[PDB]
């Protein structure tokens, strides 16, 4: 009897039913994409693109549709918040319906290619046995890959015939779907340059076509054919599994580190923007320039976009979640309602204090207020018996500039402590924890979840490379080793290992 | 002053959408999902056990 | 001991599977609305 872990090996040497089995996975994957999109559209709230973006609602496939140009819904709304203008077929609902319809067609084709497995196409004309000319098939299917790679970068991304791709400003404030022009110089290899994407898919497409032509014309070397077992289709599986986990590692790195293909306006900020003070530095710079124009601190902070401030909140950091804190970031800390304005903490003598921001590594972090030169001046003491820095005996007050609480100042220690705790999380926002009953613990964005999933898949698929790779090479000994082997395995019997013609 | 009225001031709806344009989140016992799930999988498995045994002859 | 002489083997043909699967799903469709209530 066949073991349960070798059941799907019956199509190993059946090209007709291998296509049928591969058509079924294709039907399911497109079926999932359509089903996933429809669910997300049933839960997504497009009313507030600034304080309730996609990445705060746990939307996973919505950013990927938006990344390539899908921005409008049949419901009449646009992802940017403007009103839809004749969405046409290719809406969020249309793309979801298309992947669903495709799923049904692939399901039907799978049944046909399964019932009619005994096609003369899959027969070796020399031996009349089922066989696939894998070196030629690879050239065919690579030429299509090169052709499709070229067209995506030359028509779709470039904008010649297509929507372009999502391009954002450096601080994720103003991002739209634009037609990007290929950048052919060294800046084309800048990961944060969207012009490199069009240039790459054009050049790799051209080389993909030419490589497909070569691999379609030139027969493999005899030595390479035997060394790589090119007559065995499990060789293709080993190399494909190797290539797909290489791509999974790369695609996880560019998601975690950020690139032009993972805009923060679609997937949320990266953990390194919080670590390096990417948004905080920009916010202080804009406020400082407005102060240089002789504007009041109350009105300079009011100029700061609320979208920019929301990025400076540690709750939007993708490295603050948990493996089993499931759901949307809204389910963790609530739905963002409004900015409370910048909180500036002042000593009793008037010196300004800064709350030490919480590093990403800390689940909890002591609240400590520093002055300009970095010296600890006040804090919330754990031991309130002989404290020397408690805000009560330092007279710390908090005043808010901009936002909802602009102008309002608090002096009682209880509220000053409350906002000091909020201040170490970055900017202070008002959250609605009643609609979805948020617990109060942070969650990861789609950036975090995508990275974890495709890193775990990448690691598991390395074992696949080793297993399926060892299976094809060691196929002749899969059921066991030869009975009489001792003479060859003897130490020193032969000069060269294995070679029986090199007897010592 | 206190931000207790800030969340109240959000009269403009700010929440993930319900399944209906007129909002569909009604009080149904979530035990219905489990009851439907058990009523489907348990008898389905029973039939599949008997059929696969029979189909194998 | 000696084997039991009352041994039998249960059978379920494919058409019975479809009837059984149809009944389970149809009955679930019927009662699901009431169970959720």
């Amino acid at each position: 009897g066949l073991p349960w872990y070798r059941v799907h090996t019956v199509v190993l040497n059946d090209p007709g039913r291998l296509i049928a089995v591969h058509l079924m996975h294709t039907s399911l994957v497109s079926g999932w994409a359509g089903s996933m999109a429809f669910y997300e559209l049933a839960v997504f709230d497009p009313s507030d693109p600034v304080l309730n973006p996609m990445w705060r609602q746990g939307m996973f496939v919505l950013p990927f549709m938006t990344r390539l140009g899908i921005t409008q819904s049949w419901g009449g709304w646009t992802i940017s918040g403007e009103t839809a203008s004749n969405p046409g077929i290719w809406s969020y609902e249309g793309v979801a319906a298309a992947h669903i319809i495709l799923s049904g067609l692939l399901f039907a084709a799978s049944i046909w290619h399964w019932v009619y497995w005994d096609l003369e196409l899959f027969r070796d004309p020399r031996t009349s046995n089922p066989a696939l000319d894998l070196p030629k098939i690879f050239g065919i299917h690579l030429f299509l890959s090169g052709l499709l790679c070229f067209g995506f970068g030359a028509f779709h991304v470039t904008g010649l015939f297509g929507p372009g791709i999502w391009v954002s400003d450096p601080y994720g404030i103003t991002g739209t779907v634009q037609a990007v022009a290929p950048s052919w110089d060294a800046t084309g290899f800048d990961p944060y340059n969207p012009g490199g994407i069009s240039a790459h898919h054009i050049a790799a497409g051209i080389l993909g076509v030419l490589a497909g032509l070569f691999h379609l014309c030139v027969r493999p070397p005899q030595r390479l054919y035997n060394g790589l077992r090119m007559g065995n289709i499990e060789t293709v599986l080993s190399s494909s599994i190797a290539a797909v986990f290489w791509a999974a590692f790369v695609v996880s790195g560019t998601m975690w580190y950020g690139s032009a293909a993972t805009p923060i306006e679609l997937f949320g900020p990266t953990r390194y923007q919080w670590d390096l003070g990417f948004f905080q530095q920009e916010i202080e710079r804009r406020v400082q320039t407005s102060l240089a124009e002789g504007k009041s601190a109350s009105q300079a902070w009011a100029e700061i976009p609320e979208k920019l401030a929301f990025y400076d909140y540690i709750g939007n950091n993708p490295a603050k979640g948990g493996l089993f804190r499931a759901g949307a970031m809204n389910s963790g800390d609530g739905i963002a309602v409004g900015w409370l304005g910048h909180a500036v903490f002042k000593d009793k003598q008037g010196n300004e204090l800064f709350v030490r921001r919480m590093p990403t590594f800390f689940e909890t972090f002591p609240v400590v207020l520093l002055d300009k030169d970095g010296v600890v001046r006040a804090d919330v003491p754990f031991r309130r018996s002989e404290s020397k820095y408690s805000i009560e005996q330092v007279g710390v007050s908090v005043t808010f500039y901009g936002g909802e609480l602009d102008g309002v100042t608090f002096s009682d220690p209880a509220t000053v402590k409350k906002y000091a705790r909020r201040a170490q999380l970055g900017e202070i926002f008002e959250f609605d924890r009643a609609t979805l009953q948020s617990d109060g613990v942070f969650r990861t964005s789609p950036r975090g979840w995508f990275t974890f999933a495709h890193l775990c898949f990448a690691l598991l698929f390395f074992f696949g490379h080793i297993w399926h790779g060892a299976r094809t090479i060691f196929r002749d000994v899969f059921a066991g080793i030869d009975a009489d082997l001792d003479e060859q395995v003897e130490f020193g019997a032969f000069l060269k290992l294995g070679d029986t013609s090199t007897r010592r | 002053x206190x931000x207790x009225x800030x969340x109240x001031x959000x009269x403009x709806x700010x929440x993930x959408x319900x399944x209906x344009x007129x909002x569909x989140x009604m009080e149904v016992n979530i035990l219905g999902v489990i009851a439907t799930a058990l009523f489907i999988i348990i008898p389905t498995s029973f039939l599949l056990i008997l059929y696969v045994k029979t189909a194998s002859q | 001991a000696k084997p039991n002489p009352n041994k039998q083997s249960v059978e379920l043909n494919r058409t019975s599977l479809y009837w059984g699967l149809l009944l389970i799903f149809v009955l679930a469709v019927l009662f699901s609305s009431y169970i959720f209530n």
């Binding site: - | 569909x24 439907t36 | 799903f25």
Partner: peptide
């Protein structure tokens, strides 16, 4: 949730109909 469970039950029932018609046990004479 209910709307998702109603749709799965309905399409699940439709899926059975498809298999009962095309993937049926063929009636064979004797």
């Amino acid at each position: 949730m209910e709307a998702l469970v109603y749709t799965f039950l309905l399409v699940g029932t439709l899926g059975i109909i498809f298999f009962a018609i095309f993937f049926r046990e063929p009636p064979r004479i004797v």
